[PDB]
Structures are given as C-alpha cells and as structure tokens.
Amino acid sequence: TTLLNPYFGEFGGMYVPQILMPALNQLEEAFVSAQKDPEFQAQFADLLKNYAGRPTALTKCQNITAGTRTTLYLKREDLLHGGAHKTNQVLGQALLAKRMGKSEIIAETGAGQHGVASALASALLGLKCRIYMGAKDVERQSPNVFRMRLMGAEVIPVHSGSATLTDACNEALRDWSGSYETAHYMLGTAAGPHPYPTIVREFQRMIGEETKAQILDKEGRLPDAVIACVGGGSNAIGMFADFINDTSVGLIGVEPGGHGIETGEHGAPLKHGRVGIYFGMKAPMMQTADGQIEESYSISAGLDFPSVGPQHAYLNSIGRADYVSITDDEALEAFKTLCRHEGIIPALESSHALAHALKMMREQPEKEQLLVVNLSGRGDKDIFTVHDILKARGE
Amino acid sequence: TTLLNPYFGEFGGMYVPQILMPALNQLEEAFVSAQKDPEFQAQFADLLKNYAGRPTALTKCQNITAGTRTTLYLKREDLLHGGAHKTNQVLGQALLAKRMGKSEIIAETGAGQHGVASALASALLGLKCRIYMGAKDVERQSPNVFRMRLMGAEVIPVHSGSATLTDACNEALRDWSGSYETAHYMLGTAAGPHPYPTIVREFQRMIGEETKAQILDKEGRLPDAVIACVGGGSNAIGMFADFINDTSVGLIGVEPGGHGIETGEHGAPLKHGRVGIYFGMKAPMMQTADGQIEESYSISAGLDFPSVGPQHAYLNSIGRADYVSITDDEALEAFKTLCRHEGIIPALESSHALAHALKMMREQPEKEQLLVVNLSGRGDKDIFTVHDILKARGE
Amino acid sequence: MERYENLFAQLNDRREGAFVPFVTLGDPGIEQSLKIIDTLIDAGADALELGVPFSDPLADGPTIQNANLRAFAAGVTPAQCFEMLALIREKHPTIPIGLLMYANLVFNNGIDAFYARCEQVGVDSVLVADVPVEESAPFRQAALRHNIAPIFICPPNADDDLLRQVASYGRGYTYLLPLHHLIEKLKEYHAAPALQGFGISSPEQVSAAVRAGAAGAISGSAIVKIIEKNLASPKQMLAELRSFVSAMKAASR
Amino acid sequence: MERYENLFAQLNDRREGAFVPFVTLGDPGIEQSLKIIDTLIDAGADALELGVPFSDPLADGPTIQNANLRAFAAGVTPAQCFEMLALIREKHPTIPIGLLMYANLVFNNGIDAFYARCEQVGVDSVLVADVPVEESAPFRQAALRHNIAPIFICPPNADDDLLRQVASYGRGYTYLLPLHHLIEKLKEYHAAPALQGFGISSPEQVSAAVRAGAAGAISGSAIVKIIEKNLASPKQMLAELRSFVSAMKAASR
C-alpha cells in the first residue's frame, strides 16, 4: 500500500528488494506530509532563494535568432548555485531527511556531478554525507572528488564488482538498507523507485513555474514549446510539469544521440530502447537481446545513461510530450554558437536542448515560434572536452 | 576641463599622454549623459537582470558563526553570470561604447579574468572585441585564452618588452590612441585615469544598494560593517558606495598580505606602499626607493597588483574606510571553512574578505556584530591552486 | 514446487533440517560450475539456489557481485544458464532447484515465457531479488501457472501485514532473513516452510536455525567465498566445498 | 632652456633646421650608451632627447619598450642616468639636452627636487610622457624655477584651446606629432619653436618639416632601431648611427 500512485501508466513502480520497502514507504509519507506543511515549504523557499539564488533569469536570445521568426528564451539554471539545476532538488531532499529525523545522507556518483550537489546541500544543512564511488571513477575524477572532500563529504571508493557506478549504487543501497533509520538516500534524478520520480519532479517544478510567469510577463502568452535535455529526466520534468495541463504548449525532451543512433553508441532509450525493469523501475532502457543492460554513450557525462525516468515514458506514450535526439556533433555546434553569439558557456548536457531549438529555427526559419530552452547548467566543466575534440579534428 | 572632479582629495587625475585626453573627455561626456538618460538606465537594468541574473542573493551563514555573537551575510556576486562581479561593469561599459557609436572593444588581460568578462559582454552585444595579452601570459593561460576565443574575441599575443601585462596594456592603449573613434577601451577595475574610477564605481554600485535593501528587509537595520577584498578596488567600491553617507556603517577593505607584509611579498599598497603616479592615476603603489614599480605577490591572481584605485586611498585618508590585510594562509583557511561549513566554494580573492570577517568574529566572539562580506566570485578556478598547496604541505 | 513438498516431508520423517547452498551459474566458468554443483549435491546439499549472471545487479553483496562479474566476464549468458539447468535436473531427479533472478531477465522476453522455460528445464522455484510482494502479482501468477514456487523474502523489518502476504503468496519455502516469533507467525499463517538465510556460514548457525523451528538454512554467500578463495586450484576448490557442505549438513541432523 | 634659444637663433642665422635624435640612456649598457651619444653629436645632432628607463612605461611603442628593457634589465638606474647626464653635459657645453621622463620618476623624491637635480647636471628641458597639459601645473612650475624648459606634445587631435595652452605653457620647443596650419597657429600664439616628431625616419621627412616652416625634426625611434639591429656589433652600431645622423642633418640644411 502507498499513499500516492507509484505508476505513470505502465511505467514506474517500486522494484526493490523487500528490505527497502519500509524505507520507501517512510519517505513517501514524509514527502506527502511535507507537501502539506507551510513551514516546510517556507524553509525550502528560503534555501532556494537566499542560498541558491532563485528565481533564475529568463534570457532572451537575440543574436542567435536574428533574421528568423523564432523568439528563443533560455531558462538560466546555469546561474543557480552549483552551476546546474541539480541543486534545487538536493536541497529539498536534505530538508526531507531532516524532517524524518535523519542527520546522514547517502549518495553515489560516477562522474561526480550529483556527488558534488549532494555534498553541498549536506554541508549547508550540517548533514554527514557519505558518497559511494567506484574506484575506477575516483581515479578519473580527481576534481570532483576534491570538491566533495572540501565540502566535508566522505568519498568511499568501491572496489567490488567492476568498481564503477553500478557497484557504487549497490553499496549505497546496501548501506541504506541497514541505516535508513538514521540516513537518507539522495537519488540524483527523476528515476528509480517510487517515490523518487514524484519527489524529484515536485522539487524541480519551480523551473517551469517560474518560466511560465516570466514568459507571460514578457510576451503575454505561453510558449509554443519548452525544450529540455534528458539524462535521467529531472530538469526536463521540472520544466514540463507546470505546463502539462496547458495542452497548447509543446513539451520536447532531447535524448543524447551520441555518435548517431544507427551506431548504437547513444543514450536514447525512450525512443531507441525497450521497456525493462532495473534500478527500481519499469522504464525504457537500452538492452541486449537477452535482457542485459547495454552501455550508453554520450559526449556529455550527465546524459550518458541507458535508462530514463518513468514519467517521461508515460508522457511520450500518451503523446503529451515528444522526444528527439541530438548527436555529439550537433551539441558541440550549439555549444560553440551560444559562446560566440550570447557570451554564455552552456553545459554540454544543455547544449543538446539548445541544438534542437536551433534545428527547429533553422529548418523552418519563417515559422513564427516562441521557444524556451531549459539551460540546465554552465559549461566551464566541458571546456577541455570541447578543446580536445576541436583540436583532434583540426579547428 | 572636465564635467566631473577627476580627483578624490589628492588622489586620481588623468595622467595620460596628451593624445589620449580627447578619448577620456569623450567617455566622460557620454557617461554623464548616460547617467541622466532613463533609456540607458533601463537597457542596463535589463541586461543586469535578464542576462546577468541580478539581484544576487544575500545568504545568511549559520554554521560558520555558531556559538558567537556575529551574524554574517554573504553578498553572492559569485552567482552572477560569469562567476564574479566583473560582469556588472563590463555590461555598462559595453553600453557606453554603443552610446558613443562604437562597435569595437579593446581590453588587455594578464591571468585572463577581465579578458573573459570583456569577451562575454562583447559577444552578447555583438561588439568586435580584441584583447591584448603578453605572449608569456598566453602560454600560461590556455583555459582563459580558449574561453575568450570561444566567445569570438581576438586574443592578440604581445611579444614586445617583457611580453606580460604592462606590455599588453601599453599595446591596448597605443591601439586605442589611434582607434578611439571606433573602439572603446574597457578598463577592468576602479582605477586608471578619470573617468574610469567613477564609471566603474557607478556601474558596480548595485552591489551595495541591493545589500542595503536586503539587510534592511531581513534585519531591520544597516550592517555594522561591510567587508570586501581589494585588487584594483571595483567590488569593494561597489559594495561601499551606497553606504558612504551612512556613517555608522564600517567600510573595511582587505588587501592581500601574500607571504606576510614583512616579507615584501604582498599586494597591499594602500597601507604598505607609497603614493606615486602610474597607469593614469596618482595612487598608492608598491615602489622601490628610486621610484620603479615593485612586483606584487598574492596567492590570488585577481588581487595580485602593486596599486589600488584612488577613491580607496581617499576614503582611507579621511578615515571613512579602514584597510587591512590577510595572508595567503588566512585566505586558504577561509576558503576551506566556507566549502566545509556552507557548501560554497569562494574565489580565493573573496576568501580574503571572508578571512577578515572570520577574524573579527573569532577575536571577539561575544561582540554583537552584523557583518556583510562581498563574496566577489566563485572558486572553481582556484581548486588546483588549493589542491597543490595542501598536498605540498601534506594535508 | 512438489520437489520441496516431498523434500520437507522426508526431512520431517528424519527430524532433519534442510541445508541449501547458493552459487552463481557459470562461476568461474561453465565446466567448473557444473562440477561445483555436482559436488554440493554429493556432499549433502538438500536443494540448490542458483543465480543467473546479470549486467547490473543492485541487490547483492560484494562476494556475489564478484562472482557475478567472473561469470559475466567469462561470457556466461542466460541461454547457457538454462542449458546448465536442464543438465543439472537430468542428473538429479529429486533435488529442488531454485533460481535467484533479477526482474529484467524474467521480464525480458515475457514473464510467462520465462516461467514456461523454467518448467521445461525442471526448475522448482524462483526468487526475484528486486520484486517486493507489492509488485509480485504477474510473477507469482506466471510461476504458479507453470508449477514453479514463487519464493519471497521475509526481512528483519517485517510487519504483520507483510507476514500475512508472504505466507499467502509464497510456495516452496519462505526465505527468512524476535526470530522464534517470526517462525511462529509464519506457521500460524500457513506459510511455506522457513529457511533462515541471514549470514549462514558455520555449523552452529545451522543447528540454531533448526532449534528455532525453521525448516533449515540457506548459505547465501559462504560457498561463493570458497570459490573466490580457491580460483587458482580447481581441485582444492572442490575439496573445500565438499568439506564445508558436509559439515553444514551434519549440523542439520 | 637658454641653450634652445641660442641654438634656434644660430640655426636661423644659417637658415637650417634642427635634427634631434632620441635614445634611451644606458641602452644597451652605460659605456656603449655614452659612445652612442657622443657619436650622435659628432655626426651633427643639434640637440638630444634622452630617456630614463622605467619599470612600467605605458606610453612608448615596441621599439622603445625593447630598448627600455635592455637598459632596465642591464641594471641601469635613474641615479646612474643622472651620472651619465652630468658627464654628457661636461663634454658638450652648448648641445641642448632634453629628458623624456615618466611622471613617477619625477614625482618619486619630490617634483621640485627632481628639477633641481636636472639643473645641477645641466639638463635643458623635460618632457613628461604621461602628464597632459591639464595636469602639468606642478611640473612646469618646478621646471621654470630651475631654468628647465617644460616640453609639451601637440598631438594630431589638438584643438584651439590645446594650441593656446601648449603655446603659453611650453618652453624650449613644441613637440609636434592640417600641418602647415598647426605650425602657423603655434607661431601666432608665440609658442616655443616646433619640432616635428611624427615618424621621422628618412632625410625627405626632415626637409619636409623644414619646408613646412617647423624649426626641425625629432627622430623618436629610428636611432633606437639601429641600436636594436646592431647589438652584436658595437663598432658597426656606431658606424650606422653616424651615417644615419649625418644624412638626417644634411637634410635640414
């Protein structure tokens, strides 16, 4: 039994070992209670505003759209404290941990971005944060490891199995299954078992709520479409949620196409995988014929995963949202274009959303359209990646 | 003849070759006109809000001050687009360039931070930006060089003289002396000849104006003191300006003490140099006995200069503002403290302001005091520097 | 599931508990795994629990993750595991064979078809590690349609509603992780006979389980540790497995 | 400043223009610099403009920045420059000596004391490169109290107010960077005699300056280029300096 529906249509659920069900039920109860509690809401609003910097700007491009009938706005989550939208929901989950009387946070990380977000929320709120990370990942991610340690988090190398992300996640969940009385597992996207897809959406929904108010104020109408990149689904569902019932507004999610869908080196399970069950959820995933989970690929680590959160699969299935892909090379061009023409260095994740909007503009340049791109993060972290690629091909 | 007073007491002036005086007079006129023009003000407000993200948060520390009678707020210029307060004034100067009918920007850079700020403003406003940089600097600053080039700026290596900052500045000014009809020289701090100290203050003054409004709203009174680091003087004068006439509010500027004042390896000319004339101004500077300009030193490149802007020298002289120093090691401790206890990675520049506030708290922990630190920038750029130091001494 | 009913009846006639080792199929390769499994039975294992290697297990401890990777990296596939299972069943008519599966491998080509293949090769039970009773309906339905017992875990943190559900929905045995009271309530609710599976690595824990009135004990990882320790010597691996299993089964009697 | 008045009177009696080379003192070392300076005079330089190396010049082109760094890196100090100046004056009683200074070196130990030291060693004029007429009051006052001409630049972008100020405030000569009209207005306003200093690197530019009714020409960097080109051969350096200066002075006559 649960208080809220764990499914979105056929997708979602709570596919965890029995031992973790009380932990999920506890968290669901605390979330339902928190959502009715004005004092929780006020504490969360205070962190979002005074610590993270909300509201985030909505920037009108001009140079990028010159000579077309596209008006393009960027929702500036790149300006949030921490450099990306991930900060929003880790703050909310940290407050839920305190609401349940916990003073410890568990997380896992691969490239280190969610780990840094978890560590900063935990530092602010005086929570003891342990972050599991596969030994192979620790060795490749010294900058993020150092940032997490500076923030007081304990980064715990995991040497078992393949010593990468799945092994780190396993250990984090093993820990949580024993420690959930005192420790909260801080899931880093709108995926995994209920109630995480729901919680993450509600703790990211200010992206779309602000966007709606800002667009009305500036344009006097809703956007024709809002466009977001999709790794696990959090920035995109936070942009979309407040527009779901505005049926004139297009919701476009952009998966990473990697080297090209046809190459199989991509991270686009919603349109190019197959429903399966893993990481707590029934959801699209990239799979071998015999049901092993395939390795994904993207130039952008934040999008590089073989699954997606279930609410996206559902919105797709019913036709409310449309999902597309953008390749590494398209994302790179968009990155270069925003730097040169707007003076903003976007995350390569976000560059996939921007690339799709540029394509909507360029393919049909006399089409009148009001577009909002969810600029999920800033791209300082990506300058070496971009440098290396441009150099390699001689630019 | 000028429209405004070029001096602050005995400090300031226009100590440039005669050929540059028309350029300075032109800029002064355009600034005076712009400051009376509601449409200029509205365009500047629009960029500051919708592109740069103003207002910036005012964050109340709690963990850092626990068990003392200090209440500490951080003015979050680290959250501005570009990662530091420099963005504010480059946007304003870019608009002044357009007001004068110019479509080209000239700047020079050493470590590359002002160059990046100049490039991003120029990219947004569609201005052609050339940035002079000494060849020795280009070779050491590949990341900032790459960021400037991504933003479409032309970075022009300077091989003459010592091929560092003075040589770059010389070339930038030589260029400007011939091109000032079509090109604007974008000075990167509240220093140099009139009218730059004035312009830079007025285009940074929203820091203190916002701070005043935010503190009143949250505390119902003005701060006991506002505290800012001082490289050339811009973030500090932008924090101070709106409080100058509130004579109960302390204005504390923090110069870099480097390895220790007694070592002579510091960048603290206001308290430990000698008035002189250079870079267009009569101002405190670090000098040899025979009047050569000494090399400064700080762990933090943004503070590492042997002079300071003239309005600070003046505010000091009359006793309205007080100036102190903080060493490399004090700044490093403050950096570590903010990361661990507040989840914010501050610029090492800003860490000098924070270090002084921590000292005001710790020295006198039962003193009731309301302090605001001007958190001028974020410290992603400094993590390797900090890593290297901590490793070297075995931490 | 009838193999379990028959086994427990026979053990009850002997006033003996069951001893049930877990191994990963194909660890450390197919040939050695088949030998391991024959050794476990010959040494006195009453039933087996067998794992199918999966790319991303999120519900197994380090020892098991390590074994998963040995098999998986050696190219063992589910199709090969099912070839193995048919061979194991062909050698051992009465030994109950239980699988420990991740949901994706069961759901991949259709839940019903998965259980139909289990029935074809002679498997007796399936425990799906990441399907809690709340999500179990399609799995247990397919299991029962194909004469397969659905196994559920009764965890430390169980409440009365959970006890009643596990008792009602499970068959074959109840996988059990106060203790004597869980065993009593499971019996009251007519649950499948309980096997204690919490950290069973020594003879005294087997006798304790019997003394607590459990039907027997499952060694969730001690067998795998022995494999891991002896990789460089297959012969010694079999010798140590045989000694361990013999000691553990003696404790049940 | 009387040396300039006497020089221009004498040149006027000969219907000749003045030719004035610039060099940095101590470039490329003190001994070679003294030889260079003697060579310039012997070859027919009418007066000298001499620079004092400064750590951070912000008003000189690449050629001059390069020379500044040769002298500065060779450890030439202002005190050594003033020793040189006394020696130069001791060798050459009538040749006007003008300094090109940055403000800090003049302001360092007191503006008045700087000009007093100029007077003690026999300097005739000082041009302060980064002091515009608008800021010049304390410099020109100290200069005149010590019988030193304050030199001002009249730039391309000059207006009438600037012409009147330069004419009123300067002595010795006006440093000039339509052209015949600037020269006419300077004369109308009783300015110090004009020397054209814009890019003077060939004999025909010297004759053009004379034909325009200027008092002569200043070679702001051609002499320094010759030094830079011949660093590896001091003898050849002197030979090429002598030829260049002789050619330039011939063009004035």
Ligand SMILES: *Cc1c(COP(=O)(O)O)cnc(C)c1O
């Ligand atoms: C983490 C991240 C993403 C992808 O995660 P979602 O949960 O799909 O939003 C996208 N952009 C940025 C900048 C990120 O940091």
Ligand SMILES: *Cc1c(COP(=O)(O)O)cnc(C)c1O
């Ligand atoms: C540039 C910079 C400074 C120093 O310059 P000021 O003109 O003194 O403000 C300080 N902090 C940061 C973060 C900077 O980028």
Ligand SMILES: [Cl-]
């Ligand atoms: Cl419900």
Ligand SMILES: [Cl-]
């Ligand atoms: Cl729904």
Ligand SMILES: [Cl-]
């Ligand atoms: Cl369902």
Ligand SMILES: [Cl-]
């Ligand atoms: Cl409210």
Ligand SMILES: [Cl-]
């Ligand atoms: Cl970042």
Ligand SMILES: [Cl-]
């Ligand atoms: Cl803590």
Ligand SMILES: [Cl-]
């Ligand atoms: Cl590092």
Ligand SMILES: [Cl-]
């Ligand atoms: Cl650390």
Ligand SMILES: [Cl-]
């Ligand atoms: Cl653990």
Ligand SMILES: [Cl-]
């Ligand atoms: Cl509303």
Ligand SMILES: [Cl-]
């Ligand atoms: Cl396959």
Ligand SMILES: [Cl-]
């Ligand atoms: Cl005035």
Ligand SMILES: [Cl-]
């Ligand atoms: Cl003033």
Ligand SMILES: [Cl-]
């Ligand atoms: Cl004055």
